[PDB]
Amino acid sequence: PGIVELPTLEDLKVQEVKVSSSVLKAAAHHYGAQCDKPNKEFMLCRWEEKDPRRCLE
């Protein structure tokens, strides 16, 4: 039935947000106010493509 295409491990590397859930929650409102545009772009890509491999960037 064909093979499954998967990204390489090197393609999956990115600088990580390594703050705990309390830190994220304390800044959640301002974070959603400031970083809205890239997050909305990512969510639109995610819900339109229906494939996690097409919204890595």
Binding site: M43, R46, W47, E49, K50, D51, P52
Partner: protein, 69 residues
């Protein structure tokens, strides 16, 4: 007796012709209907023997709290 109680042979002759035509057409139609029934039940591509499938109008085409449905 012939003049009072009976008709000429042509009436019975041509009535027989009409009856034979009707009966032969009915026999051909019966055979054709049997063949059509067989083909329609075998293939399912005609008006007959149409069995219900799920209505596609029942599907919800909305975002589903998860991008991948």
């Amino acid at each position: 007796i012939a003049r009072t109680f009976y008709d000429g042979p042509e009436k019975n002759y041509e009535k027989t012709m009409a009856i034979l035509q009707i009966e032969a057409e009915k026999a051909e139609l019966r055979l054709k209907e049997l063949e059509v029934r067989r083909l329609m039940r075998a293939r399912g591509d005609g008006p007959w023997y149409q069995y219900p499938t799920i209505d596609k109008a029942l599907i919800d085409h909305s975002p589903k709290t998860t991008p991948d449905n």
